[PDB]
Amino acid sequence: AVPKKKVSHQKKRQKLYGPGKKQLKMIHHLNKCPSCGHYKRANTLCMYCVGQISHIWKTHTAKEEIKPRQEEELSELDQRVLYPGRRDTKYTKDLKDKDNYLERRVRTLKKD
Amino acid sequence: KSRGNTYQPSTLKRKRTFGFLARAKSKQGSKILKRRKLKGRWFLSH
Amino acid sequence: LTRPWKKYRDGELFYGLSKVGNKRVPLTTKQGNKTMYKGTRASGIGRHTKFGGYVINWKKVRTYV
Amino acid sequence: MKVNHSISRFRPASWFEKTKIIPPQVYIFRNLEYGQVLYSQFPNFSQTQVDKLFVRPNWSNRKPSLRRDIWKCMCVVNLQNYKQSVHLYQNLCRLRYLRDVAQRKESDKLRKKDSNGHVWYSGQYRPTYCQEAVADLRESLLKVFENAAKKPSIYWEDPWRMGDKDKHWNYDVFNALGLEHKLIQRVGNIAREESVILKELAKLES
Amino acid sequence: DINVSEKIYKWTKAGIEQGKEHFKVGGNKVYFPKARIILLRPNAKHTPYQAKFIVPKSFNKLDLRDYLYHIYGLRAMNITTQLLHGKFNRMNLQTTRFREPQIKKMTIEMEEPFIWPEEPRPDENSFWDSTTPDNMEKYREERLNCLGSDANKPGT
Amino acid sequence: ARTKFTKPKPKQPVLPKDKIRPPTQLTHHSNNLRITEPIPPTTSNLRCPDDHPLWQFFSNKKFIRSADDLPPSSHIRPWSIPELRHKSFNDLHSLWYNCLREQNVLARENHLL
Amino acid sequence: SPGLRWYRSPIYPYLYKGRPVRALTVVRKKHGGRNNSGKITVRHQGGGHRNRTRLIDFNRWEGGAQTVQRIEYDPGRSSHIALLKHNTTGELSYIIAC
Amino acid sequence: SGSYQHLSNVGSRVMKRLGNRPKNFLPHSEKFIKKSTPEFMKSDLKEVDE
RNA sequence: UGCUGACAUGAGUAACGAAAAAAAGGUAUAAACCUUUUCACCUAAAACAUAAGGUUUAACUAUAAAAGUACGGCCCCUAAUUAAAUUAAAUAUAAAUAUAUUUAAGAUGGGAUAAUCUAUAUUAAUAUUUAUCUUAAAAUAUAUAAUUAUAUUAUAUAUUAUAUAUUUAUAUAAUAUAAACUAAUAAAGAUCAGGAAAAUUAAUGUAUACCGUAAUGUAGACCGACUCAGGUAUGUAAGUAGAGAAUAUGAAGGUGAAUUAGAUAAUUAAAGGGAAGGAACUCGGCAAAGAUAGCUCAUAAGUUAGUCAAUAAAGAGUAAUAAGAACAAAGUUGUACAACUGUUUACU
RNA sequence: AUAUAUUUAUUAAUAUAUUAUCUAUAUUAGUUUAUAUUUUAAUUAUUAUCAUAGUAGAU
């Protein structure tokens, strides 16, 4: 149930790193994407090219934003009177800074 | 019967028992207050 | 998640920084029971009625001349 | 004892004619807390009226409190006949129902949304409901006059509350009628002596 | 002859007609008042015919009305009072906690409307320009809360 | 509880066609009613006066006095007690109220800042 | 019920089946057998039914003929009490019933 | 800020304690201030008491 | 089993706390945030109103709006009770103090008026607990005033038509569902016999103070060291079903979560089914299994006479015959001990 | 009912597409249901969810 001794430096290290099962393997199965000449996984789509195509689809197949007439044709002063500004909470501010906590996809290296 | 929740707050009761004025009014409470003052306490009572 | 930037369990609270603190700090108008009335030195103006109403006494009302 | 008052039921034209408490008119009430509007046949109202209007409440359109201070008269609309006023009141109730239950999605689409796709608010005050009520009032009145002497009139709390006298409120039917957009006299505590003011208005057109 | 509310309304109307106070003036004559009031910007829930003030915590509704009449010449017809809560604050967790001040805010209704002047641009006014102090605050946060290898991490 | 053995209840006793009263209200809401877009209240209907007494809380109708709009520190001095001592009561009272007014203007601005 | 099995109480049909005169009744303050210390001095006394003590005349001073109007149940004594009415005076009073 | 502290004198004792820091822990107090301030703001000379 | 600090080991191991998710888009930044649609879960709640509590957590600083009527406090009044208070000498007492009496405080309670809206000030003058039956009345049908069977039976409002003051008032007549529920009324059964305390006319008044109001509240926002399957007061709690607040469903509302994706060995947990046998198991039928109406009938020995035994066991009617939702309902007996309903070692 | 087309002399008739089957008032306070009035406010085929895999018979 309980360790009888302080496990030594040797014995913890040979346990962890000695076996190949536990080690990380080289990703030999990279290959060139045909659409953009960059690294991608074998039997896998290029995340750049499919992302680009998804973006294209979004730009074309776009549901139009609903802008109400009455709010679109308000005067500036009138709009200010109706819908004044406010102090956002700390939480709200944190939520707004998305680049702090949201990871954009990185581009791979160009294949040789 | 699970224990641990022996504190059951109720502001009124707290102020009656452990409030400053209750301490002031009793002789014993006044002595306590004095003792706390001597010690240097920032908060003498609830 | 309570907040999406904190995915894992840091020792951060649901709200604020610390739950604990000095309980012995003077009461305000907001705190206490329904019966707890603090007041704000605003109205020694008139007189409370027998029935629970109030009757202003204008000789004891502040004008700013 | 006598349980029911004038307010306790819906009152048709015949009842009004029999009694004559007030002239032919409909009262409209802003909610200072949430911005919601409350129509009524009388210058007072009860929980029953609130229940009737606020039938499908949610977080956005919460069922309002009946506390007297937050309710304030937006608009007092007078008409040519008791029957006409009753019909207007019914139309308003119908419109409200449509907005809440039947044709809710269309109403939502029409409204102003903020970022994160909610109907624009400041606190729990939502300024769209009032606007809708003004638009709904305009619609109901128009319908009444299509269906169809004293010149009718709409005594406003505030002249600002009109969308625009050019863009709206200048239909041909209204003009033919002589729809006078007056405002309530603010020479006194408008909130506190509201009932008195309403009584005075009622007296004026009789 | 007539009811109380109606009488009050009549009195108010008479006072308005006079150009005298639209309300019964008190007897406790304060010649040299030290109270200041902060005219606030209007919220969405208010109209152009309303104005809200931060006032003294010991300021009465009647007192406020009197102040508005005599100091400024404005007649507030209806007045409400909103005493705010005092949330707990502390400089750091090593310090003692205490409440922020309960602050009294009184809305008034007035017979003529009012809309504030439009707030200035960043380039125009020196003081009303939140970029600098906010940036400074951010920099302070970075520097105090920077620990190890985030010292090398470039500044925002 | 409901069971295999539960026989259904009888239908409610309807009042006959002749005996039922005609309802007091006959003609209800218009079926033609339509959800129109809202009509947002406009400043154009207002006539905010140029001498509204609430402008007295501002200074030259400015949301905020800039550094140039403010009176500079070298040019300005507070009153000396001796100077005050030979002023009349009414004058002193007026001065006090002017001071208070100025504070209010600054207090509004200071708070905003 | 097995609790009913041994419940005997004497039936008095002549006994009054109404409330006592309210002017002659004071509240019967409960103690739980606790003295001014707040400590249980007398054991085995506690939360009974609510009661009113009845002011019954033991001294019997006034004199003159008095008619017994009714005979009542009294919760604070084993005896019945008799509501007397003074024939001349008309003053009302309680007395231990014979 | 979103403070409201400036319209009152709340937590007065605490403020006094902070304001009147002991002089032998003045380097401690100012070390972190120096760190906080940018190069163009900070000065080398000692901020003397009133 | 020294004290304090720092850092190891177990170990990148267990665990990430009852849980239903999917796609598209915000965004070529999202398992976790927002929106839309789909799907699910709670639904006499995981809903909607509130009480208490609390680092304001809120839809936020441009912040929770009250003269009063199905608005609370404050105020008046007092209960339980409390009081360095109160009375040459109230009484007692090593001091502290204690007692009795006064006065003052003290809500968990009582408190005038009100939409046909309402006016609270000043001065003067003399109600434990339970029940709404039977009878009687008239009404509706069958038979030949009287019988039989069936509901109805005190109050709550609009309409119409009359008679009196003069379209506003008063009274009368007639018209008009069922089932729950409310308040107010009346009469009244039982012993366990049911709070306390604070006047009326007239004249003159009344410019209506202060505080509470967010959100959370069977909970991530309180008490449990934690965003803890624990503890936490009250009122509404769509319909369909039913004796019902049981049980099923779920209109609306709210929610689908600081862990995910896969795989589903051994093994564990919590479930479902099982041939032939049927307690052979085991200390012991522990556990599991077992309900051939729940309504209406009927129901023994014994016995303290109490359908106590009884919700008797078996059994009948209605329903169903191959079965085909949930929930209520789980035998009979002998002996020892204790009359019985209760109480007990909060955590063996 | 709206929108888009075709015929007809904006109207009516036809075709296609989309949305809808609500609502309000009476029956003495409230709630539900019922009927009447009001309104355009529908009844057949086939699915799904939930109730221990809802239960049961096979597999």
Ligand SMILES: [Mg+2]
């Ligand atoms: Mg503890």
Ligand SMILES: [Mg+2]
């Ligand atoms: Mg105690």
Ligand SMILES: [Mg+2]
């Ligand atoms: Mg603690």
Ligand SMILES: [Mg+2]
């Ligand atoms: Mg509170």
Ligand SMILES: [Mg+2]
């Ligand atoms: Mg009040």
Ligand SMILES: [Mg+2]
């Ligand atoms: Mg009012």
Ligand SMILES: [Mg+2]
């Ligand atoms: Mg208030």
Ligand SMILES: [Mg+2]
């Ligand atoms: Mg004994």
Ligand SMILES: [Mg+2]
């Ligand atoms: Mg050692």
Ligand SMILES: [Mg+2]
């Ligand atoms: Mg291991």
Ligand SMILES: [Mg+2]
């Ligand atoms: Mg393992």
Ligand SMILES: [Mg+2]
């Ligand atoms: Mg694991």
Ligand SMILES: [Mg+2]
């Ligand atoms: Mg995405």
Ligand SMILES: [Mg+2]
């Ligand atoms: Mg249930």
Ligand SMILES: [Mg+2]
């Ligand atoms: Mg809630």
Ligand SMILES: [Mg+2]
């Ligand atoms: Mg008292």
